[PDB]
Design a protein around this motif. Structure first.
Motif, PDB file in Angstrom:
ATOM      1  N   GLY A 240      55.550  11.063  -4.565  1.00 31.53           N
ATOM      2  CA  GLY A 240      56.995  11.204  -4.464  1.00 31.53           C
ATOM      3  C   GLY A 240      57.672  10.022  -5.120  1.00 31.53           C
ATOM      4  O   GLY A 240      56.998   9.076  -5.537  1.00 31.53           O
ATOM      5  N   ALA A 241      59.017  10.064  -5.210  1.00 31.96           N
ATOM      6  CA  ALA A 241      59.834   9.023  -5.840  1.00 31.96           C
ATOM      7  C   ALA A 241      59.587   7.636  -5.261  1.00 31.96           C
ATOM      8  O   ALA A 241      59.538   6.659  -6.005  1.00 31.96           O
ATOM      9  N   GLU A 242      59.395   7.563  -3.946  1.00 27.85           N
ATOM     10  CA  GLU A 242      59.136   6.342  -3.201  1.00 27.85           C
ATOM     11  C   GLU A 242      57.881   5.663  -3.728  1.00 27.85           C
ATOM     12  O   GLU A 242      57.890   4.450  -3.938  1.00 27.85           O
ATOM     13  N   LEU A 243      56.792   6.439  -3.949  1.00 28.33           N
ATOM     14  CA  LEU A 243      55.545   5.845  -4.421  1.00 28.33           C
ATOM     15  C   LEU A 243      55.608   5.453  -5.899  1.00 28.33           C
ATOM     16  O   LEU A 243      55.187   4.357  -6.246  1.00 28.33           O
ATOM     17  N   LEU A 244      56.190   6.305  -6.742  1.00 35.55           N
ATOM     18  CA  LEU A 244      56.358   6.039  -8.159  1.00 35.55           C
ATOM     19  C   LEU A 244      57.095   4.719  -8.418  1.00 35.55           C
ATOM     20  O   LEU A 244      56.641   3.950  -9.258  1.00 35.55           O
ATOM     21  N   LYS A 245      58.121   4.383  -7.600  1.00 36.42           N
ATOM     22  CA  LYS A 245      58.828   3.098  -7.744  1.00 36.42           C
ATOM     23  C   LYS A 245      57.907   1.909  -7.497  1.00 36.42           C
ATOM     24  O   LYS A 245      58.074   0.882  -8.157  1.00 36.42           O
ATOM     25  N   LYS A 246      56.900   2.070  -6.603  1.00 35.95           N
ATOM     26  CA  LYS A 246      55.928   1.021  -6.263  1.00 35.95           C
ATOM     27  C   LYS A 246      54.855   0.804  -7.327  1.00 35.95           C
ATOM     28  O   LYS A 246      54.105  -0.168  -7.236  1.00 35.95           O
ATOM     29  N   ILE A 247      54.743   1.715  -8.309  1.00 36.33           N
ATOM     30  CA  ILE A 247      53.765   1.567  -9.391  1.00 36.33           C
ATOM     31  C   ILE A 247      54.404   0.612 -10.397  1.00 36.33           C
ATOM     32  O   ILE A 247      55.338   0.998 -11.104  1.00 36.33           O
ATOM     33  N   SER A 248      53.958  -0.661 -10.391  1.00 40.30           N
ATOM     34  CA  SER A 248      54.542  -1.712 -11.238  1.00 40.30           C
ATOM     35  C   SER A 248      54.261  -1.517 -12.734  1.00 40.30           C
ATOM     36  O   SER A 248      55.085  -1.902 -13.557  1.00 40.30           O
ATOM     37  N   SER A 249      53.138  -0.868 -13.073  1.00 43.69           N
ATOM     38  CA  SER A 249      52.759  -0.551 -14.450  1.00 43.69           C
ATOM     39  C   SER A 249      53.622   0.632 -14.899  1.00 43.69           C
ATOM     40  O   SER A 249      53.547   1.697 -14.287  1.00 43.69           O
ATOM     41  N   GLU A 250      54.481   0.434 -15.919  1.00 42.77           N
ATOM     42  CA  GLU A 250      55.382   1.481 -16.440  1.00 42.77           C
ATOM     43  C   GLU A 250      54.575   2.593 -17.118  1.00 42.77           C
ATOM     44  O   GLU A 250      54.995   3.749 -17.113  1.00 42.77           O
ATOM     45  N   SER A 251      53.456   2.217 -17.773  1.00 42.71           N
ATOM     46  CA  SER A 251      52.565   3.130 -18.482  1.00 42.71           C
ATOM     47  C   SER A 251      51.883   4.134 -17.528  1.00 42.71           C
ATOM     48  O   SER A 251      51.932   5.346 -17.779  1.00 42.71           O
ATOM     49  N   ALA A 252      51.299   3.625 -16.420  1.00 46.96           N
ATOM     50  CA  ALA A 252      50.624   4.433 -15.395  1.00 46.96           C
ATOM     51  C   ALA A 252      51.623   5.365 -14.731  1.00 46.96           C
ATOM     52  O   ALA A 252      51.335   6.554 -14.587  1.00 46.96           O
ATOM     53  N   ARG A 253      52.831   4.834 -14.412  1.00 50.56           N
ATOM     54  CA  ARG A 253      53.945   5.557 -13.802  1.00 50.56           C
ATOM     55  C   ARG A 253      54.365   6.709 -14.702  1.00 50.56           C
ATOM     56  O   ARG A 253      54.455   7.846 -14.239  1.00 50.56           O
ATOM     57  N   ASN A 254      54.537   6.434 -15.996  1.00 55.45           N
ATOM     58  CA  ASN A 254      54.889   7.456 -16.979  1.00 55.45           C
ATOM     59  C   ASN A 254      53.822   8.559 -17.058  1.00 55.45           C
ATOM     60  O   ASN A 254      54.173   9.738 -17.109  1.00 55.45           O
ATOM     61  N   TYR A 255      52.527   8.182 -17.047  1.00 55.91           N
ATOM     62  CA  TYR A 255      51.453   9.170 -17.061  1.00 55.91           C
ATOM     63  C   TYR A 255      51.513  10.109 -15.829  1.00 55.91           C
ATOM     64  O   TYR A 255      51.441  11.317 -16.008  1.00 55.91           O
ATOM     65  N   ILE A 256      51.621   9.562 -14.593  1.00 59.07           N
ATOM     66  CA  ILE A 256      51.676  10.374 -13.352  1.00 59.07           C
ATOM     67  C   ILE A 256      52.810  11.393 -13.376  1.00 59.07           C
ATOM     68  O   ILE A 256      52.584  12.557 -13.048  1.00 59.07           O
ATOM     69  N   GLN A 257      54.002  10.975 -13.829  1.00 57.57           N
ATOM     70  CA  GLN A 257      55.179  11.835 -13.922  1.00 57.57           C
ATOM     71  C   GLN A 257      54.978  13.003 -14.903  1.00 57.57           C
ATOM     72  O   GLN A 257      55.702  13.999 -14.810  1.00 57.57           O
ATOM     73  N   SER A 258      53.974  12.906 -15.804  1.00 58.71           N
ATOM     74  CA  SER A 258      53.681  13.987 -16.751  1.00 58.71           C
ATOM     75  C   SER A 258      52.867  15.119 -16.093  1.00 58.71           C
ATOM     76  O   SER A 258      52.793  16.225 -16.638  1.00 58.71           O
ATOM     77  N   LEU A 259      52.254  14.847 -14.928  1.00 63.11           N
ATOM     78  CA  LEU A 259      51.432  15.867 -14.258  1.00 63.11           C
ATOM     79  C   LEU A 259      52.264  16.887 -13.506  1.00 63.11           C
ATOM     80  O   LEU A 259      53.322  16.547 -12.958  1.00 63.11           O
ATOM     81  N   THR A 260      51.772  18.139 -13.451  1.00 67.60           N
ATOM     82  CA  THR A 260      52.465  19.193 -12.713  1.00 67.60           C
ATOM     83  C   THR A 260      52.410  18.811 -11.229  1.00 67.60           C
ATOM     84  O   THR A 260      51.359  18.381 -10.742  1.00 67.60           O
TER      85      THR A 260
END
Ligand SMILES: CC(=O)Nc1cn2cc(-c3cc(NC(=O)c4cccc(C(F)(F)F)c4)ccc3C)ccc2n1
Length: 350
Positions: A240-260
């Motif tokens: 969820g949005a709460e966890l994505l904000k905690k991912i400090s790596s912008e690259s890893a965060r961007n990859y997760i958001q690409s998944l269905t």
């Protein structure tokens, strides 16, 4: 009071040990050291003697050596490996080059137990209880194991368990590549370098081990980092949005958001026939947000362990000073600190 040492060549390595250690036999080798099985004639115990490989070759190696010695000297718990002895054939600091560490010889590990024997719910309860009892102790000293897996858990004939680290090689990228057990029990935040991780990385590993004791199968046998992440997210749901904000790596965060996006699965439909209390505990351990994951102390109080839980018999560690971790020293300084620790060692009582 220095014992008499004798020399022997075991697999192109020169071992020099006190006479009390007899019938040395090779049991393992790697980058960090070589391990021999032996009989301690003084205590009557079957032991494992680890000779560290070039312990002071670099600052990194010297610090790692000092680190492992400090950690082993501190651990005093029924469910965690203990140091029976530490020695050097060196008579002084000037001639100090080799370190040997002695522990109990471990028979079977948790992998050998799950192999041919299908574990009952009561057996699973006792094994996980002990892992969590040992972890509560490790975590109370602000130590993170980081590599909990079935091969690092020794289990005797009476199903008594100890947490260890029998790893002898460098935990490299190559060692974590592909269809490998070295990565199947790792928390996604450490596996994908999402953020500065805490000790709940170890709770994720317990959840993975417990699921495997209950089904006889690896919970996330990924063929690579990404395939393993997809196996994880299919079960626990995409973040969820709460966890994505905690991912400090912008690259890893961007990859997760690409998944269905995927919902969390019904664990009762994944772990068919499992005790509903086991299912409940599993749902609290296998949480993607490490901040919301149950701790070892909270887990020992879970109703799944009602039969074993004794709050008066789950001890915490003595204060552990690890101020050295942020110290910048030369090899000779790390060596002299290691030397003081070897000579100050007091063996445990019978
Ligand atoms: C058949 C058989 O018995 N084989 C066997 C026995 N072995 C024993 C050792 C061994 C391992 C250590 N270090 C740690 O365990 C360790 C290190 C850091 C943290 C923690 C934790 F406390 F965080 F877990 C634990 C020290 C000394 C020995 C002799 C290594 C390989 C091995 N192979």
């Amino acid at each position: 009071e220095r014992p008499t040492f004798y020399r022997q060549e075991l697999n192109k390595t020169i071992w020099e040990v006190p006479e009390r250690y007899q019938n040395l036999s090779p049991v393992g080798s790697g980058a960090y050291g070589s391990v021999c099985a032996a009989f301690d004639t003084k205590t009557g115990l079957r032991v494992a003697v680890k000779k560290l490989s070039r312990p002071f070759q670099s600052i990194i190696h010297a610090k790692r050596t000092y680190r492992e010695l400090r950690l082993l000297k501190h651990m005093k718990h029924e469910n965690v490996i203990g140091l029976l002895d530490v020695f050097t054939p060196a008579r002084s600091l000037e001639e100090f080059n080799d370190v040997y560490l002695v522990t109990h010889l471990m028979g079977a590990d948790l992998n050998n137990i799950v192999k041919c024997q299908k574990l009952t719910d009561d057996h699973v309860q006792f094994l996980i209880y002990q892992i969590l009892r040992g972890l509560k102790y490790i975590h109370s000293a602000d130590i993170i194991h980081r590599d909990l897996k079935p091969s690092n858990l020794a289990v005797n004939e009476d199903s008594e368990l100890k947490i260890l680290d029998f790893g002898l090689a460098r935990h490299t990228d190559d060692e974590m590549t592909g269809y490998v057990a070295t990565r199947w029990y790792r928390a996604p935040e450490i596996m994908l370098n999402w953020m500065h991780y805490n000790q709940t990385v170890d709770i994720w590993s317990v959840g993975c081990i417990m699921a495997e004791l209950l089904t006889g199968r690896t919970l996330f046998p990924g063929t690579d980092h990404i395939d393993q992440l997809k196996l994880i997210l299919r079960l626990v749901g995409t973040p969820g949005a709460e966890l994505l904000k905690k991912i400090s790596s912008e690259s890893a965060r961007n990859y997760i958001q690409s998944l269905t996006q995927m919902p969390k699965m019904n664990f009762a439909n994944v772990f068919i026939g499992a005790n509903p209390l086991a299912v409940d505990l599993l749902e609290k351990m296998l949480v993607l947000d490490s901040d919301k994951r149950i701790t070892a102390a909270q887990a020992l109080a879970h109703a799944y362990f009602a039969q074993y839980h004794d709050p008066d018999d789950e001890p915490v560690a003595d204060p552990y000073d690890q101020s050295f971790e942020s110290r910048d020293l030369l090899i000779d300084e790390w060596k002299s600190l290691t030397y003081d620790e070897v000579i100050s060692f007091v063996p445990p009582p019978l």
